[PDB]
Amino acid sequence: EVIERARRLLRELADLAEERGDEGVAAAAREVERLVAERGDRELAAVVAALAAAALLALERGDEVLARLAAAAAVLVAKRERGKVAKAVAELARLARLALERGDEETARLVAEVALLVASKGDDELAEKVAELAREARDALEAGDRERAREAAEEALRVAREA
Amino acid sequence: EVIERARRLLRELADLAEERGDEGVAAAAREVERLVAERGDRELAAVVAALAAAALLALERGDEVLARLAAAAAVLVAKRERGKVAKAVAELARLARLALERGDEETARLVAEVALLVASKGDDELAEKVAELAREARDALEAGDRERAREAAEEALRVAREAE
């Protein structure tokens, strides 16, 4: 019942994402839903259900930041990503929050995308390259260099995109 | 390291929630962090870290509903609750989603708190009472009776807070 509950929430997330044009989270939802099925884990399914609910609620509002990080978390949890990719996505999450409090919606949106791609592709080399870019963006934000922060975030998106 | 990673996220969640006045969420974070430490379970720490990050980002965004629901999830996972309390939190979460979609943000907020309290206390009896009040609030929502929906959620909150 938990497994079906989670899978139901992922299908609504995939549906809503496709309707909104957010192919990234729709792809993630579809991959996560498969992972939830194969693992057959009650506890894992519950956790994915919460994250999927968060993403679904965020995307209904239009909050790509919350939608994509909640999606990225679901991909991390479903894939059981416990390593360099997991730490990278955490840094991107740490950075996105920093951007939000700094009134920097632009980088926060960009960083949110990077986290979802890094979670999806799960390549350790990409994880470190992006983690390197994320730290530079973090110092830029902490210093008030909003411009250099965005540039580092845009680089992170391109390197993730090409991967 | 995951375990300390989780515990750090729970402490900031407790701090920020305390600063926002959402003592319900702060109390949950402190209880969950104690469980994460005592259990010393890497896998539990990883998933709880995910929820704590979700809740923490939710409060940064301003969405108390999402913050409290993510906290309620973390409490359920940490406490390993798969009974009447678990089903209640699920029903309450769906009710919060319905309230938000129906443009009744207040009831969604109240209902979100109820879910966190029901998760924390883990009373099967409280779970059942709240389940009845939740259905009344849902039916009110489906009809467009926001006032009775709010009233039923407020009743659920009052029963959840006082239950020990």
Task: Give structural notes.
2 copies of one chain form a homodimer. With 163 residues, chain A is mainly alpha-helical. The first copy, chain A, folds into 2 domains: 1-80, no CATH class; 82-163, no CATH class. The first copy, chain A, has helices spanning 2-20, 23-39, 42-61, 64-79, 84-101, 105-121, 124-143, 146-162. In chain A, helix 4 runs parallel beside helix 6 (105-121) and helix 5 runs parallel beside helix 7. The first copy, chain A, is globular. The relative contact order of chain A is 0.12. The A-B interface holds A 2, 5, 42-44, 46-47, 49-51, 53-54, 56-58, 60, 63, 65-66, 69-70, 73, 76-77, 82, 86, 90, 93, 96-97, 100-101 and B 2, 5, 42, 46-47, 49-51, 53-54, 56-58, 60-61, 63, 65-66, 69-70, 73, 76-77, 80, 82, 86, 90, 93, 97, 100-101.
List the helices and strands and how they pair.
The structure is a homodimer.
Chain A: H1 2-20, H2 23-39, H3 42-61, H4 64-79, H5 84-101, H6 105-121, H7 124-143, H8 146-162
Helix pairs in contact in A: 1-2, 1-3, 2-3, 2-4, 3-4, 4-5, 4-6, 5-6, 5-7, 6-8, 7-8
